[PDB]
Amino acid sequence: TMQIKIKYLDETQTRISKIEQGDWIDLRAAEDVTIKKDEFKLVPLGVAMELPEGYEAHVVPRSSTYKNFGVIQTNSMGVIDESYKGDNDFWFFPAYALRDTEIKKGDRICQFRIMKKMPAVELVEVEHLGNEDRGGLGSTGTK
Amino acid sequence: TMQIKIKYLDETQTRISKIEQGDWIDLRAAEDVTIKKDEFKLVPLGVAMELPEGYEAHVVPRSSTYKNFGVIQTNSMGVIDESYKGDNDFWFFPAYALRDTEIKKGDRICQFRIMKKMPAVELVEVEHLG
Amino acid sequence: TMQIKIKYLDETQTRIEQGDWIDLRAAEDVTIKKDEFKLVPLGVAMELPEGYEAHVVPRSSTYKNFGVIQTNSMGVIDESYKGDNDFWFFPAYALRDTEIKKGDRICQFRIMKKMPAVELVEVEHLGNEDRGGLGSTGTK
Ligand SMILES: O=c1ccn([C@H]2C[C@H](O)[C@@H](CO)O2)c(=O)[nH]1
Ligand SMILES: O=c1ccn([C@H]2C[C@H](O)[C@@H](CO)O2)c(=O)[nH]1
Ligand SMILES: O=c1ccn([C@H]2C[C@H](O)[C@@H](CO)O2)c(=O)[nH]1
Ligand SMILES: [Cl-]
C-alpha cells in the first residue's frame, strides 16, 4: 500500500522485483563492468526512485556478492535519502575488487530496503556527562 | 516479550547470551577456523533460528573482530530473511582475512539484532520523476 | 524533539537536525600506510535518548577522499556508551597511503530504537522448511 516510484535508465534495464523469500529487494548492474584486482568502480544500478516521504533506502551487498563477483562495497551500506528523487538521480554501487572480475548487465549484485528516517533530534553540548564509562573496542573479551 | 527460537548445531556449541551493556547479541564460531591472508571463508555460527513473525535479523562484526581476527565481513551487514528458519538453515559469517588468522570455537566474532521487515510496497514504474 | 547530549574531547573539535544522517569528523590528523589499520578518533562522546542506539557508516565520499574502508562495516554505538571518556571512533583500514586531517568529515550516524527485550528459547527442532542461503537464488 506504500508506493515507490521507479524510473529506469532506459528500456534495456532489467526491471527489478520482490521475491517471497527475500526480505530486501535485489538491484542489478546497468551494464557489463570489468574490474581489475585492487581497483575500484562505481557500478551503475540503472534506477532512480521517489521514496515515500519520511523514508530512506539502505543498500548492501548480497551474501553471495563476494563469491560471485569478488567485490566489497566501499561505503559499507549506502543511504539514499527521500530527497534524492530527481529525474536524473540514479543509484550506484561502489565496488572495490579483491580479484579480477566481470559483472554482467542485469546481474543482481546488491539489495535494498526502505525504513523511516531517524526522528527529529537536537544536539545539546554539555561540558560533562557524569556517567560511568562502558569501555569499547572489545572490552567484553572474546570467550 | 518476543521470543526467538534457537536450535544449536550440536551440544558443543556455546549457548548465546544477551549482556546488559550489549544492545546487539554476540554470535560465536561453531568450530576452529583457519583463514590465510587474502582468502575468504564462511565461518559457521552454529545456530538456526525462528524469528518472530514479520521480523528479519541483521548481522555485523564486533568492533574488535578486525583487531582480534584480522577479518572483514564481505556483505557489510548480513540480512537474515524471516524465511531462513529451517532445521538446516544455519547462520554464517562471510569473512575475508586481511592477514593469516585463526578463530577458535566459541569465540564471539559478530553480533546480531532483529528488526521488523520492510512492509509490502508497490513498485510503480514511471517515465519521469516529478 | 529528542535531545542528544554531546561532549567534545576538547575545545579544538569542530562542533556539529531534521532526520538526515549526521556527519562526524576526525579529532586529529591521521596518517595511515597502505594495508594498515588505524582507529580514527571522532572527538565526541554522547548520551543518546532513552532506548536508542546509534549506527555509524562511512560517508559516500570517504573512499574517494581517503582510500579507507570501515573494518566493522557499520558500527553500533551501545546506549551504555555514554561515559565521560566513552569517545566514538572510526575503525579504518587503508587500501592506499593516506592522510586524514583534523576536522575532516569521515563518517555519518543516525540513532535508532534498540531491539527490545527478547527471550531466547532453545529448541531441539524448528519444524520449518529450509529456505537455503548464500546465493541460493543465483545472479540472473
Ligand atoms: O551507495 C550509495 C550511496 C548513495 N547514493 C546516492 C544517494 C546520495 O544522496 C548520492 C550522493 O552520495 O548518491 C548511491 O547511489 N549509492
Ligand atoms: O551474513 C549472512 C547473510 C545471510 N545468511 C543467510 C540468511 C539469509 O536469509 C540467506 C541469504 O542471504 O543466507 C547468513 O547466514 N549470514
Ligand atoms: O565503530 C564503532 C563501534 C563501536 N564503538 C564503541 C561504542 C560501542 O558501544 C563500543 C563497543 O562496540 O565501542 C565506536 O566508537 N565505534
Ligand atoms: Cl541504520
Ligand SMILES: [Mg+2]
Ligand atoms: Mg538474497
Ligand SMILES: [Mg+2]
Ligand atoms: Mg560488544
